[PDB]
Design a protein around this ligand. Sequence first.
Ligand code: HEM
Ligand code: HEM
Ligand code: KMR
Ligand code: KMR
Ligand code: H4B
Ligand code: H4B
Ligand code: ZN
Lengths: 411, 411
Amino acid sequence: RFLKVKNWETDVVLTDTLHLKSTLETGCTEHICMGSIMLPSVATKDQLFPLAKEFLDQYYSSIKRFGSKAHMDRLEEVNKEIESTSTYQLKDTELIYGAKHAWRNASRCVGRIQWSKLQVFDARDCTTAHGMFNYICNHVKYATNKGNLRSAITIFPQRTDGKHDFRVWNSQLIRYAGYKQPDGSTLGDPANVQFTEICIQQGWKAPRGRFDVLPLLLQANGNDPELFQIPPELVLEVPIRHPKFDWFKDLGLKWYGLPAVSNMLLEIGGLEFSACPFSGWYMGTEIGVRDYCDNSRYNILEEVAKKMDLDMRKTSSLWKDQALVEINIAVLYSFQSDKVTIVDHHSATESFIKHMENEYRCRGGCPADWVWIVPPMSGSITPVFHQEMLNYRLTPSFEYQPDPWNTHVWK
Amino acid sequence: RFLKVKNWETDVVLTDTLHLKSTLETGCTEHICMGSIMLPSVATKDQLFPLAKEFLDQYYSSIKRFGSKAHMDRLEEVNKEIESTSTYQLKDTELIYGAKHAWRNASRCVGRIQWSKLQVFDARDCTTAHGMFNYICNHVKYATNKGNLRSAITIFPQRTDGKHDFRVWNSQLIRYAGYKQPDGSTLGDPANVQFTEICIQQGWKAPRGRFDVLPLLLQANGNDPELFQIPPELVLEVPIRHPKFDWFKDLGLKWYGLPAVSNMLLEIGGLEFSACPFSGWYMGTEIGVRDYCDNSRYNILEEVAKKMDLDMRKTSSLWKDQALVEINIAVLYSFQSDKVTIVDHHSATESFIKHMENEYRCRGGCPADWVWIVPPMSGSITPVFHQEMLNYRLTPSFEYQPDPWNTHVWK
Ligand code: HEM
Ligand code: HEM
Ligand SMILES: Cc1cc(N)nc(CCCN2CCN(C)CC2)c1
Ligand SMILES: Cc1cc(N)nc(CCCN2CCN(C)CC2)c1
Ligand SMILES: C[C@H](O)[C@H](O)[C@H]1CNc2nc(N)[nH]c(=O)c2N1
Ligand SMILES: C[C@H](O)[C@H](O)[C@H]1CNc2nc(N)[nH]c(=O)c2N1
Ligand SMILES: [Zn+2]
């Protein structure tokens, strides 16, 4: 009931009591653990008020005014709004608190040490696709800060009935296109081959190359979505070069600077924000391991091994491992030499351990998903590999949601 | 109730129904996932018969004779033995079946594709420490097969009352010693510093070097344990050299060929075998990542980076990642050039995926612990990283047990 997590590299123990405030369900049972399943699985006023009260009770507890008259009046004020309107509206302060704690509670995020320095852009007055584009352009420009990347979120109107949803149909604001070929192979990013098609079905004219930035597909208030091109001056890109291998430039790789997730749902006080793009900075391995070396993404270990003059016959020559490291030295060096913010999996995992220590002290724990927190290379020479972690669902939270093209009434 | 696991690199889906036969508990609840906790947590005749029947019902189902007279008579025969003796004895066939399925059911083992080719040595007639030594020497000689390693297990008498336990106090039959120093640092393997002391307290005379093979501390029938030196001709070792770097020989590293776990408990039909050493062959990363590069083990990334002429100032130069790969190319090359059996994390993880496919087809699933199955380097360029896995506890099984020095009445 008051569980213990141990670190097996330092023999450090921490006691978790925050998991008592956990609410949602994990997918695991007493007889089965699903902690490696990727996606485990209209709101009414009956459910809304307990969720609002639970959220408000922790908000007012956070500003040192638990249960005061200002608290009780806001509780009644919201209770009466849910009675009248069958929903309610967050104060700006509550919105910023809510957003910051959805990040704080993101168990799959290794970067949460930064959770309190989030810039929240309130876009709940938006009504059109064009307004979303404008709001999203300002988000991009701010978060990029000329390479001095700053974390931020832009929050579009909450879900009302269900058929009037604000949605960014892109999974990230900046992604490269994926084109299949007549010979079956893929140009660009295979991940986005389907979304790259949908843009064309809606009228996008593709430059059909490698690193072609996709347009935005913005759906406002349930209406059919619309295409907008992000001004290229707003899309910062880093060309990937190596500090030793000069042939690495001829690989002609590059990546975008701003990681900005746009397909998730923000839950605050039982209110659902279906469009809530949020951005930080990359850990190098996201690019240099997954984006570049997944078999089903850019898949470059092939060429990189070739140019290094590697034994590619035997699997046991570790030619894949050796080329994977060079690629990540180059992603980091390129970003740093350009002064674009990035963190290596060593610094980032060390910071999460120190974050964890801060959380258990001043909060009673920190939900953490080991499967996602451990980096995709060199796992056990980073400190989080040896750190036991308890995973549980706290609110406010970011949640997955269906891709909007599978659920949307059209025209 | 009939769950689905997905592979996110191949889009392959498999349906798990074997988890219905799961029995023990995982430590997880509907509200908390503990799949990253390392160790989550006298038998009477009331509990023994359901466990015996459940085991016998699956044994006789495995030889195509479910519920026959030969089955029903064995059920009654065991029921009457548990009535008379408050325990029972397995047939040799049932012992071999039991042992093979404890391996098959080992969710943290990536090598299970081999589970049916296990050599089972029945040592239930053993009565003395010296007998254990003899049985264990024959196990070592057989499993090593001059480097053509063969999987095997030796099974000492089952637990009767509790104070008459057979125990191998070593955690592995072959381990290197760990000596602290006057200046605090450690010589050899820091993992075994405590056990290396216990041997001395019992009278071991240490050659106090690096790779000094520890003696065996064998406890028979509850009596105080006794020290035996494995004949050095029986302990096969590989010196670690690199196929490119000739200075790598001067590192003077070497490792033993035979991985042989001796501190776990084998459960079959509700009977507990407290001494049951079992052995296979190494995956290279067990040596070259964990044993060699854990901060709390040999910790060699220091020197290896030095001799490679690496940028060791910045963390983001990935000098640790680069040296980690070289060390694992060398472990593999050394073992192979000596014809000592070993598997690289690529071949081994590929084989486990194909094992998984075999299991789901002919068995309805395969319990698997993602946290342990993914190798400690290059995680996502191996296929198991992208494979969802369901973890659950099947019996027969290998279980953890307390270290015997913490629990043993002495003299
Ligand atoms: C500022 C630096 C940040 C770093 C270094 C970082 C690091 C990471 C990494 C490596 C992942 C795993 C992504 C993947 O493997 O696909 C992740 C996931 C995640 N990030 Fe963070 N992140 C940062 C900022 C943020 C911010 C500002 C938010 C929200 C406001 C956020 C919310 C999340 C969530 C909810 C997930 C997991 C959900 C999912 O992606 O499936 N992150 N982060
Ligand atoms: C034959 C080749 C084998 C390979 C390549 C292999 C591979 C592995 C690896 C890499 C681990 C993780 C160990 C660690 O990280 O400390 C492991 C664990 C395990 N192995 Fe296998 N193994 C093999 C044979 C066997 C055999 C013959 C048995 C039993 C009869 C067995 C039972 C287990 C169990 C029960 C565990 C997990 C329990 C624990 O170690 O905590 N293995 N194996
Ligand atoms: C804000 C942010 C920062 C960062 N450094 N990285 C991310 C990546 C999140 C990937 N999610 C889940 C996987 N999904 C396939 C794509 C979306 C987000
Ligand atoms: C039979 C076998 C083969 C193999 N290749 N590897 C192993 C290692 C098992 C490590 N276990 C758990 C961790 N524990 C600290 C030590 C004992 C066993
Ligand atoms: C904290 C975590 O449970 C612990 O470090 C685990 C992680 N995964 C592992 N996986 C394997 N194969 N072996 C281990 O010792 C561990 N250690
Ligand atoms: C099967 C498994 O759930 C899946 O491949 C996960 C594993 N861990 C991950 N960890 C991170 N950070 N990102 C991912 O996409 C994944 N994928
Ligand atoms: Zn779990």
